[PDB]
Amino acid sequence: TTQYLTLGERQKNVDVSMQASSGELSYLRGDKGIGNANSFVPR
Amino acid sequence: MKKILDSAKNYLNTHDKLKTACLIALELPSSSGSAATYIYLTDYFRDVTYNGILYRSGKVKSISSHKQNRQLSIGSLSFTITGTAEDEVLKLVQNGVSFLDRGITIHQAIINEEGNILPVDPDTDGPLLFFRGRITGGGIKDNVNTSGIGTSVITWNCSNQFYDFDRVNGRYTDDASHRGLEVVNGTLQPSNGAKRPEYQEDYGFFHSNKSTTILAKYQVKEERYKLQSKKKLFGLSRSYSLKKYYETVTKEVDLDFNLAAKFIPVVYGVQKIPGIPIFADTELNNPNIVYVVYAFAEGEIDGFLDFYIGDSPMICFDETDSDTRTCFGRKKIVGDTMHRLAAGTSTSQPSVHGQEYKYNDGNGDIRIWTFHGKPDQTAAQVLVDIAKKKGFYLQNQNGNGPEYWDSRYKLLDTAYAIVRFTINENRTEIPEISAEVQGKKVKVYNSDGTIKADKTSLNGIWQLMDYLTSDRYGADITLDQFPLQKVISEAKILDIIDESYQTSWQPYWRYVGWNDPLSENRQIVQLNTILDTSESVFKNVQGILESFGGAINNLSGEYRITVEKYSTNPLRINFLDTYGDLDLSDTTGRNKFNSVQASLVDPALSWKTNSITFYNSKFKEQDKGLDKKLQLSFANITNYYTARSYADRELKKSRYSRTLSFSVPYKFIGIEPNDPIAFTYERYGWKDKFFLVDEVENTRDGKINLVLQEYGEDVFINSEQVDNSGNDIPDISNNVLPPRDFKYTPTPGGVVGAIGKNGELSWLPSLTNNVVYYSIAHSGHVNPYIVQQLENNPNERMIQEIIGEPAGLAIFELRAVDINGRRSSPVTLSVDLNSAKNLSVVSNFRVVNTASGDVTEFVGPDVKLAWDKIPEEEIIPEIYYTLEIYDSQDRMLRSVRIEDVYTYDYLLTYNKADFALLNSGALGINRKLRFRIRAEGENGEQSVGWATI
Amino acid sequence: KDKFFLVDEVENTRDGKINLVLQEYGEDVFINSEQVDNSGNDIPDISNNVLPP
């Protein structure tokens, strides 16, 4: 039915030198998407 | 102790009136890193010229004193500048914050009777260096009395050479950092800055630092159609339902990969470290096959001892564990490594670089590729071959083609292992991977001159030397800043064989660094270190030093690494030679110690801490049973016996302790901390009493403040031994034969990281053996270019490249060194250098105000000069043009530098006032003019051919 | 010339002497205002070199 493979832990470090983005909110709340804290695509 | 020239000692003894001077060479800030300038100062009454550098005078008021003791700490020094000078008040007030972290060098120079500088330092026949470091903050104070005389004093606060240690220099798994891409200013493109020019083409850390948490859909093959594997008991009946054979069926797999970005550690000796996954994935069709690549260590390490799948290592510790979890081989006395699995190993050889290992524990299948770090290693062939077939799911989902994991993904200088897990119902997830690894290969400099860097070393001195000489992960210190002989002797001192225990007493010999079960593995100190590069280099160096009680100090520019040892050749100081003051104090009561808690990790129990306490019963009885624990560091020690010997030695050494403080004149210059002193004072009953220097302070007055430490009779690590002549005195070595073929070949088109590259200069190694490095002096540069030789140099000549210097003359001086310090005669090569980047000439160059009747006639009083913007401007960040004006009879009138504007406006008032008078002293006008312009970049970029009209 | 500071510490004495400890800050670091746009090009300048002997 459904199988999950897990590895690692999300990194909560944020670089405030670059402009703010919604990807940070998506990444910092455990949303499903592809990217890092400084650049996250939330699907 | 820092030896000085014999003539220096003779002059200091014979001459009573010393005319000292401090030659400050202060660094000056600039907007662009391609511009550098220095302001030179001195407190001498007249400007002092040294090495063609004019040290101005009249601004430095006073200098503080340099204090340094046996404990590694960031020393400080403050020198005042007269607050009445306008230059310095303006500089401090309006730029005193931009001066932070700017270098400064102060030389204690003795002025001869002929006004020359008496050669003291035997390394360069120059002044003895007094201080070096960087500024940290400033300050001014104007106290104006309404009646009398006010004062204005400018103060600068510096920090000694250990302020360069606070930097954290550890390779980061982030792709941008490793490839050195320019700091994202809204866009991301490569940049010059990088720890190696080759990294910029390495994409090993691509796909790392990211996260992929999606509900992916895999079209898993099999279990949709085709013949089933069921046969009904009834003979004729058959399962017409189709399944279990190849046909795609949808399957939702909720994969969640979070490849974090952690600093790669540096490991010396044998230690267990976790994995830092840098690329996770799974097959395109089968989710049950997952590829994960972990970055374990740094540099060119030896093989991996074993891999800890979850918590259970592949090889078991004992027979009991062997029956408990179906292990392979044993690691207690047999000491089997990973390489047992591949084939029967007579020796306990570690893993082989680029070799695959297959491991089955009854729960699944684990395939491991052990790639050791290397200076030049190719990409993972298996991963590249899979990528060419687009076998990775995430590759197809993202759309990447064969470039997903290309040949350019060679993980350079990183020891990584590829692990393939066959996910099954017994191993349902990815177990966090840890491995046992051998440390980075470390050079061991033999006293002969020959080196060997073919294995990892447990010696503390060599490990610290490796940490302090590597730019990639440690404090970048060039090898010319060490006394090689002294370091080698200290390394020998820490290799004294201990007789407390026998080799057969410690079972897990393989996993305590002992490469052999029979050879003499009992050294008095053995360190198995995990250098977490996240922490500051300062903290790492302190942690290494605390293991064996050593101490590092830099006075006079030489980095001394010394440990408390007994010496048979102390410096004889007599109380009369001392100033009047003396101070003997007793501190035994406070420093008495009789116990120590040792939290050391024991491989036998898996690498977990053992709370072990060492206490000397006799000391406790003497101390009335009171417990006195001394905080000792056992983090870097894994062999139990070495830890116990360390504990016993330290406890013994803390039972007798006194401090003797006095001041000795400038005759004894260069007295380093932790130095042997034979103090004689007959009224006390002392005859050459043995002391060890603790704190030494140098003052500008020449007074040296000393604080000595007294110890027991035979409490030193080196006690009850007699030093040999070979180690005590260096052997007689012939002067280094000068290097040959010292020639410079220009490079017409040159670029290294998108910056101008000039030619290259090459030479042949000196024929004299034991040469360690070739130092080259470049005119106009404070820092000579030093390139260390190699074991292969005896055949092939070495080459060094010079980049970014401006077109013009350069004087290059080449000379070598010996491990004993012996130096070849300098080799000179005076040549002219081409521009770093030959720039295009100015497109057009004309006068706007030109008469229509004829060309080359300006009618208006003011000449308007304009020209086109240079092409390829965007290639170079900052550029400027130099314009020169010449007279009819060829005398230059002005050289004007113009930046960011291409339309100069010559004025009549200029031509008369600033030019006619300056050229003849009388009012006049120049009618025939001449103009030439060049386009100059900053980093040694100069146009070719001038330009005129 | 009218450099901008902020009073950090003020002490009032019975004699009337008012001790002060001012604080200095970088440009446009306050909550109020920031430079709308940093310079996008080098600011031009005119400089004269040293005439060679």
UniProtKB/Swiss-Prot annotation, chain A:
Q: Which domain of life is it from?
A: Viruses
Q: Relay the domain remarks.
A: Probably forms a coiled-coil structure.
Outline the subunit composition: Homotrimer.
Name of the protein this chain belongs to: Tape measure protein pb2 precursor
Native species of this protein?
Escherichia phage T5
Question: According to the entry, what is the taxonomic lineage of the organism?
Answer: Viruses, Duplodnaviria, Heunggongvirae, Uroviricota, Caudoviricetes
Q: Which gene encodes it?
A: D18-19
> What part of the entire protein does this chain span?
1085 to 1127 of 1219
Swiss-Prot record, chain C:
Enumerate the subcellular locations listed in this protein's record, separating them with semicolons. Virion
Please state, per the UniProt record, what induces or represses the expression of this protein: Expressed in the late phase of the viral replicative cycle.
PTM notes: Ubiquitinated by the Bil antiviral defense system when this protein is expressed in E.coli MG1655 strain expressing the Bil system.
Role noted for this protein: Forms the simplified baseplate, together with the p132 collar protein, the baseplate tube protein p140 and distal tail protein pb9. Closes the tail tube and, upon infection, opens to form a channel thereby anchoring the tube to the outer membrane. These changes allow the tape measure protein pb2 to be expelled and phage DNA to be transferred to the host. Also forms the start of the central straight fiber, which is continued with the straight fiber protein pb4.
Self-association and partners: Homotrimer. Forms a pseudo-hexameric ring. Interacts with distal tail protein pb9 and straight fiber protein pb4.
Protein name (record): Baseplate hub protein pb3
Organism per entry? Escherichia phage T5 (Enterobacteria phage T5)
Give the taxonomic lineage as stored in the record. Answer: Viruses, Duplodnaviria, Heunggongvirae, Uroviricota, Caudoviricetes
